[PDB]
Design a protein around this ligand. Structure first.
Ligand code: NI
Length: 341
């Protein structure tokens, strides 16, 4: 049974609710982004309308084999009518194709569902600025003050300088980058670019990247492993065993691996600046954990919410425990009293 926080009242609409069989009354299923927790349940056998971005539609067609007739892609930043209700899709600053959705209810209520997002001050000059929002369905992943991390720019700067230094000292070193879903592509694209290489990967990953409308992508990626000195691997293989094994396969082309594991937040953030980060090393293999987030920090979320001044907030993440729910409601009240809405 679909929980309440995936339902849009006064509509036949749901958001990110494909794992419940047929939903009573739902004439249109929205998908915010192509991450597995959110699409869970979609397959080539699905027979109801799906509304999403163009990029999310490319991935549903080609990766999940949903049939074309059920895929309804919408342009961003454009007022659209769906089943007699005005909607707008906005960029979520999450992974490729990720959107927020604005619903203008027939009775005058305005609802924003963020899906997954990383809040940014640039969102204060979208179509959100134009009018008032009564309900906010909020990505609350990191809704606690201890969740700090740097900008995506500072993290990319670190990674580029790290890779460039190591490979300039040793031209026989190989760089490896972990992945398990779309998002965070900038990590491996920026590293390959400073190294003058294409990024090499499996056929299944190349296919996924081919759906994302990245400009000049054919210049940046390849399935020919041997010609490239930046390789992508599944995240689970980014360990001393998995990397040794991969190094055997390259056939004495390389004598060193430097690898990157993009995580979300980890507690090493509570004590250590990005500049100061060090790897775990075993022999000729070094692994860096780098905190590249595609979710709001506490401060970025607080800022967005105090700017938006919603009348009511419904969290969509960390909703399973009483202590979580209670903690989140406390921060919402502080924020409200500090800004005075
Ligand atoms: Ni996500």
């Amino acid at each position: 049974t679909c929980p309440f926080y995936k339902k849009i009242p006064g509509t036949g609409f749901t958001v990110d609710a494909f794992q419940y069989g047929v939903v009573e009354g739902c004439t249109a299923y929205f998908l915010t982004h192509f991450h597995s927790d959110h699409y869970a349940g979609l397959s080539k056998h699905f027979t109801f309308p799906v509304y999403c971005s163009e990029i999310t539609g490319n991935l549903l067609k080609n990766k999940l084999h949903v049939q074309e007739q059920y895929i309804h892609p919408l342009p961003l930043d454009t007022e659209c009518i769906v089943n007699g209700v005005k909607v707008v899709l906005l960029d979520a600053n999450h992974c490729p194709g990720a959107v927020m959705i604005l619903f203008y209810l027939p009775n005058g209520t305005v609802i924003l569902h963020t899906g997954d997002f990383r809040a940014d001050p640039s969102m204060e000059r979208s179509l959100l600025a134009d009018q008032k929002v009564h309900m906010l369905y909020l990505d609350t992943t990191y809704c606690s003050p201890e969740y700090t991390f740097p900008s995506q720019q500072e993290v990319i700067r670190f990674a580029i300088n790290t890779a460039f230094e190591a490979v300039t000292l040793n031209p026989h070193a190989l760089v490896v980058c972990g992945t398990y879903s779309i998002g965070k592509e900038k990590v491996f694209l920026a590293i390959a670019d400073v190294l003058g290489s294409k990024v090499g990967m499996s056929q299944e990953k190349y296919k996924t990247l081919q759906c994302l409308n990245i400009p000049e992508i054919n210049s940046l990626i390849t399935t020919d492993m041997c010609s490239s000195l930046v390789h992508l691997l599944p995240m689970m293989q980014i360990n001393f065993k998995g990397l040794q094994s991969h190094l055997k396969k390259c056939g004495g082309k390389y004598n060193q691996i430097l690898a990157f594991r993009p995580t979300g937040w980890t507690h090493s953030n509570k004590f250590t600046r990005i500049a100061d980060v060090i790897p775990q090393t075993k022999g000729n293999i070094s692994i860096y954990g780098i905190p590249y987030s595609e979710h709001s920090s506490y401060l970025e979320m607080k800022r967005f919410v105090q700017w938006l001044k919603p009348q009511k907030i419904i969290p969509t993440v960390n909703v399973g425990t009483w202590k979580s729910r209670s903690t989140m409601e406390k921060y919402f009240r502080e924020w409200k009293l500090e800004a005075g809405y």
